[PDB]
C-alpha cells in the first residue's frame, strides 16, 4: 500500500501514523508550523530558483545602451 495523498482514520477520528507520529507536540506548535504551510512543495522551490536567477539576472543589454552611466 502506502498510497499518495492518502491517510487512514481510526475510531477516534485521528490519522493513523504510516511512518512517523507528530501528534505529541502541542496544538500551538502545530498551528505555528502549519499556518504558513500549504499543499504545495515543488512550486516554492522553483520560485526560489527563479528569484535567485532574478537576483543574478544579466543587464549587459542595458550597459550597452548606457543605463548605468
Amino acid at each position: 500500500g502506502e498510497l499518495s495523498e492518502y491517510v487512514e482514520v481510526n475510531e477516534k477520528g485521528m490519522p493513523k501514523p504510516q511512518a512517523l507520529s507528530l501528534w505529541n507536540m502541542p496544538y500551538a506548535k502545530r498551528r505555528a508550523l502549519t499556518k504558513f504551510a500549504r499543499g504545495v512543495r515543488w512550486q516554492f522551490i522553483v520560485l526560489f530558483i527563479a528569484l535567485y536567477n532574478f537576483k543574478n539576472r544579466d543587464d549587459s543589454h542595458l550597459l550597452r545602451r548606457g543605463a548605468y552611466n
Binding site: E2, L3, S4, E5, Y6, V7, M14, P15, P17, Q18, A19, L20, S21, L22, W23, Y27, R30, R31, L33, T34, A37, G39, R41, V46, I49, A50, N53, F54, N56, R57, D58, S60, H61, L62, R64, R65
Partner: protein, 103 residues
Amino acid sequence: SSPLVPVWNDLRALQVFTSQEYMQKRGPGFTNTLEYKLSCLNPVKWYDMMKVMPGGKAFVGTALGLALFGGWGVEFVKNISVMTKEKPPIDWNNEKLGHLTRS
C-alpha cells in the same frame, strides 16, 4: 516513487487536521467576521469554490486557469533559464519604414 510518501502523507494529514481543529476551536461566528464578507465579494473565492462543483465545472475551472494564467506560467518557466543568460540590446524599430502615399 520515493519512500518518503508516508512521511508526506503524515505531514499533509497534520496540516489538514490541524486546520480542522482550528475551525472547531474558533467555532461558529465566521460569517460575522470581515474575512467572510470579503470572500463573498472576492473573485478568487468564487473561482475556487466553482472548481469543485459538478457539471464539468472542474474542467471549466482548470481550462480557465490555463487559458488565463498558465500561459504566463509556461512563459515564466521558459524565462527562468533566460534571465541568467547574456542577451543583446533590443533593436528598437525606427518606425520609419512602411509609410507610403495612397494612389
